[PDB]
Each structure stands twice: as C-alpha cells, then as structure tokens.
C-alpha cells in the first residue's frame, strides 16, 4: 500500500503515521525527519536545509525529490510506503507522476489555523525514530522520555511561534493546491482521497484512519 499524508503544520500527520506504519507494515517517509537527520549528521545530501528550515521556508524541490528517490529505493519500500510531508508542492507531485509512482490513498488532515501554534510550541520529539509527543495534549508516559526507548526527548529548533506562522503561510501558498491536485486524481480513479478531522483525540483520529484504510 502507498499513502500520502497531506495537511497543514501540526495537523497530526507524524503522530498518525506511527500507527499506519505498524498496522500495514510500511515505512514512514518523513521529509522533515530526513532533512533534520541530514543536518544533524552533516550529510552532503540534505545538510543545506539547515538555514532554510530555520527561516520556516520550504527546501528546494530538487533537494527533497532526491532524498525521497534515494529513500524509497531501499528494500524496506518494495512493498509499499507512507509519504509523510511529501509531496509539498505541485512540482514534487508531478515528479512522482513522471517517475510512475502510483498511490492508493491521499489522506488530508484538517485542523483550524488557530490550533496550530499551541500544538507546535508544546511538541517534543524522539529524533532517532521520529516519534512525536505534546506536553499537554499527548504527553509521554514519563516526562521528557521516549515511551519506546526511554531516551531523552528534544525540542525542534524551528518550533517557535514565529517560525510556525511562516510555515503556515508557506502551506497555504504552496501546498494547499495539492488538495485539488489529488482530489482530481481521485476522480480519475488514480487514487482514493479522504479528509479527516484532526481535532479529535489521537485515538479517534487513528480509528477514523483505520476505517478508511480498511
Ligand atoms: N517536501 C518538503 N519539501 C520542501 N521542504 C520540506 C519538505 N518537508 C520538510 N521540509 C522542510 O522541513 C521543515 C519542517 O517541516 P515538517 O517537518 O513537515 O514540520 P511541520 O511543518 O511543523 O509540520 P509536521 O508535518 O511536522 O506536523 P504534523 O502534521 O506531523 O503534526 P504532528 O503529528 O507533529 O502533531 C503536532 C503536535 O500536536 C500533537 N498532536 C498530534 N495529534 C494530536 C491530536 N489528535 N490531538 C491533540 N494533539 C495532537 C502532537 O503530539 C504534536 O506535538 C519545512 O519547513 C521545510 O523547510
Ligand atoms: Mg509529519
Ligand atoms: Na492508484
């Protein structure tokens, strides 16, 4: 199975990706996680993203397209994959199409703009896995600790309010058109498209997604 997670910053894509990955046995491909990992390791493919992410801007298409091509070429992706935060622009989506990458589902995560800042300012992450928590809305079992490894959680450099507001502008201008892009693809029979209410509790969004994915 091949799935695209689509949605504004903090809509809950990464959170729900964890369950989808476990349930259907396909790897999570998060361009955000991959770019951040590249910056941390000083990897030649992706380290350039550092200043761009700080500014709250989108990384260039050709850079993220290359990262995705390399990643989904790995053997853990021969049986399907979960694209999380990719594609983020029309050229990224067309690049998939040109590459002949079919998808089964496009899942839109809907949240009001007014919830996004308070979500991301309370976000804590386990960088090695990509697991995500929230100090108020979805805390770990033990404070500041990853539930699975027990390792110390961290705060993303780009998760301050001002940076979030800039990512939100970027999403409305560059990414929002992908709703129509894939809705049109769905009408042509090339994929299914579904929208979920991401304001519900984590467990319920999970249930709604399971109902869609069967
Ligand atoms: N294709 C691409 N092309 C170009 N540039 C790219 C790119 N991909 C990345 N980049 C670059 O990387 C930068 C960062 O992008 P990115 O890594 O995608 O971060 P983002 O813009 O902040 O949005 P996310 O996708 O990480 O949020 P999310 O939908 O996964 O929500 P989450 O589960 O975390 O949840 C949010 C918070 O709310 C909590 N929460 C989750 N669900 C719920 C719920 N139901 N109820 C209450 N709280 C919840 C969570 O615990 C969490 O704390 C970009 O600016 C760009 O420069
Ligand atoms: Mg994500
Ligand atoms: Na398809």
Author numbering: 1 to 214
Task: Reproduce passages from the article.
AdK catalysis, which plays a vital role in cellular energy homeostasis by catalysing the reversible magnesium-dependent formation of ADP from AMP and ATP10, is dependent on distinct ATP- and AMP-binding subdomains (ATPlid and AMPbd). The turnover rate of AdK is limited by product release, and it has been shown that the microscopic step accountable for this slow release is the re-opening of the substrate-binding subdomains. AdK populates two main structural ground states: an open substrate-free state and a closed Ap5a-bound state. The ground state structures of the P177A and Y171W variants in their apo- and Ap5a-bound states were determined by X-ray crystallography.
